[PDB]
Amino acid sequence: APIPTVEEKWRLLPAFLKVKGLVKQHIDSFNYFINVEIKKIMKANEKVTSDADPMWYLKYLNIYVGLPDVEESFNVTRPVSPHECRLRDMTYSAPITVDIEYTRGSQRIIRNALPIGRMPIMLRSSNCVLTGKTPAEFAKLNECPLDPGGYFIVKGVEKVILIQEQLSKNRIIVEADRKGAVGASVTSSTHEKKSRTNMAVKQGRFYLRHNTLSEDIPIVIIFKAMGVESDQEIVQMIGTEEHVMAAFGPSLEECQKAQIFTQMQALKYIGNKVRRQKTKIEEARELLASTILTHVPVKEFNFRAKCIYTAVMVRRVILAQGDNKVDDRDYYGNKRLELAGQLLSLLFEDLFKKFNSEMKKIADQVIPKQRAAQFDVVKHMRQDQITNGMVNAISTGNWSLKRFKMDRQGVTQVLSRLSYISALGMMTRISSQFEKTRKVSGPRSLQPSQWGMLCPSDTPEGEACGLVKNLALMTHITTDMEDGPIVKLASNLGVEDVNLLCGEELSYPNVFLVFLNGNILGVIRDHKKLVNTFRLMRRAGYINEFVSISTNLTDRCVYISSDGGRLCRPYIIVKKQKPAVTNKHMEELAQGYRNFEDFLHESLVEYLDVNEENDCNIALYEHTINKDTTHLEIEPFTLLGVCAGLIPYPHHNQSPRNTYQCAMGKQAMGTIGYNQRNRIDTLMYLLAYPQKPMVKTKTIELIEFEKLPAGQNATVAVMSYSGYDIEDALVLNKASLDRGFGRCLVYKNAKCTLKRYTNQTFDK
């Protein structure tokens, strides 16, 4: 008997596109920025203190962004549309108002709105003038209803912050060395530090390397430096099997060659190795508790939780040299996508700290010197620093932050307006990390981990084939979570603490670690109970539904990830060979008694991450479900992207032809939008008589390509004619060309500025 199919299961996709995916990724990141992260940066820098003349301070109370404005010549302001900002070649910005509390002799002096700078507002975000409006009210603003939004406007050009792809920080990566060695490393990044530690086996003895230390030091010296001195506890934390000890032997035999037996002696040994930026012991103790493996916390200089972590690193090196199961940089569970919010956070943080430092410098110069009368800092808020910083970093494309050592170039691109699909396609690119170093042919290939997260067909052809990729139709990038209740749920579920044991329990066959974004929460027996109970607490809504949990049965670690920037994707839950979505549910969706979030909370749809779908068994169609299924694919045509959605019958072609079509579909002359006659752009191609396609995909109906199309239905004979059509050439018709086929208008621009000089003389 055939399993009965839910035939209207397709509707879960247009209901999904109302909320998430299809440039709403950028908008939900920028809303997160201007609603929590600017307050968090203000909380991290809430009080400045001048060095000379203390007990005088500036205290920021709260910060705001508000609606966009414009500054004019006669000190008059008026709210603005985006289209006026496109025409007049200005930047569509809103002023940052912050309320301060400070001292002028009188100890409590307050203000409620002190404007310090202008944030560029991304279109259709929470502060933009466009959102929530009806298609009758976009006419009075001269803005297209189908213009996707998510691009800034700075100095009249439309700029898009591209989705940057990174390697996931704070995670143990076992890689091969150039000369045949196998070493591990973790780029330990928190908000206050980024540094890469290592682990090298260059003689059969485990050396640790770091940018701080002048020379690599052996690992057992470091274990003795971190408050565990007995060699038995070290080898217990490493492992109790025979060949682990046999591989670790010459590292023990090194530490008995020198006289390192006491923690003070080991810290003295390290204190000679430190590059000097109490000199011996404190510069090694603060180095261990602040810079080597900095993503692991030290409470009261209790180094136990860092000893366990570096023992896990050395155990993975030893078990990796036995059988070469190294990890790869290309698995997309280990990637994280950095959206527009997580670059504007860094930019605003660096600019705000330079603002506070410049203000503290001016305050330190002017207080002890000029006059006994207490000045105010309100006369010293030069807004040009914040405004020029934000605008130059968006409009130029380089993010040189010396605080964070980030020197990325070419983040922003001018939004290409050749057609509608060009705009909608550049709003979903993912620029890769390497950015054309050399032809490595490792990350350029299509890995199978990109199933349903990224587009298999759409990639550029040329020098960048495979680096620039495009998001799929039905994906979602997570934001940062609160990190709170995951720990409290994990502690109640039988996770014993790591401090209540020696390392011998780490090498048992029944004991799995748990991690949380790279930090050990403890150990656990019966991991299946933990994973299933945690998933049933996720589906009921007590945990935020993007928290994924997976199990690595080889390395014996149960990951629980909660950081933001990783790719999730909805599925239909299958419980004992039946789908959880019944026809009554899709009928209630088609009538309007429920929406997609109510599918999330009734345990019908859940978001798998890439790491979590490593363990799930996904069935594509209903007739593939067997006894070991957990999730059902919602719609399999959402495997392909947006630009591959133009193709009719793409599963009949040879796959290079789909990539050539994904390149050529961004260049098709069409119609930009309904505002295309009020719009002065640099180079705009229109088609005189566009037509909607005769064989259309469902993607065309979703992204509304049939409302403003690009191309004309042509009566095509397929025959050989007159030999002028040899290598891909095609013969047209003269009468069709005369009656209007392929007629196209080309609009160009010519601008002239008439500036007033510093002298009172003007161009004329």
Partner: protein, 284 residues
Amino acid sequence: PGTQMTLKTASMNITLGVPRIKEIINASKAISTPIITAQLDKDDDADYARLVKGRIEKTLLGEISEYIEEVFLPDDCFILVKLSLERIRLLRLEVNAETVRYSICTSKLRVKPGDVAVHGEAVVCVTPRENSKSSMYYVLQFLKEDLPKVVVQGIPEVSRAVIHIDEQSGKEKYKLLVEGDNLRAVMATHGVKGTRTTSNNTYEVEKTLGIEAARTTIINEIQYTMVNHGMSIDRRHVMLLSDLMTYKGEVLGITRFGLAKMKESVLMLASFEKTADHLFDAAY
């Protein structure tokens, strides 16, 4: 024809295509996957094949020793190694305990011939001495892991070998593909016909059989790589390329160092790399 090669292709993986032509004309001393094709005189039986195969393939002491043990006695401490002479008899080797005595004392921590005994026909003890150079008398742990990694029989540079068979109906003979980079040793073992064996690595043939055999090796190897991809080059072109590399007695590259030895020029090399040091030294 490098543009027409799509890097297209049961064991012995060889690099073909553009990287093989690049490895040939660079004339580097060590190439990835060298393969020595050896010929056997008595090409009839696999029993004759596996004898010389064991004579040239590297076999480790741990691969024949059934157990290697550290024994502590009250009067002495030593490392007893019992050889599995059944597996020696089946692998058809010319080794016994006295051969394992001689293979040890070859560059291992300055051990002495008196330090090794030959107690049985199957057992060997190794009594360690103090190293007296940044080590402890408990160096038995170094010897307990290092001693299975010593080689008692075979060529020290050959990683592995494989028997290869022919297909024609009139005959059946066994050639011996050897993945190693010491041609002089493979040519000199008993049972391998040294007058008909070749290589891939041109520098080894230069070191062993002369410059003119290096010229012939470069010709045959470029034309082999070109024929495997279906492209055809007339033999005069690769002949002139091979004569350009070996007209100064030594195989030279097409890299900047060999081009510096062929071309005397200054501005030619200054166009290539090395910002201003060539110009200021040539002025000097």
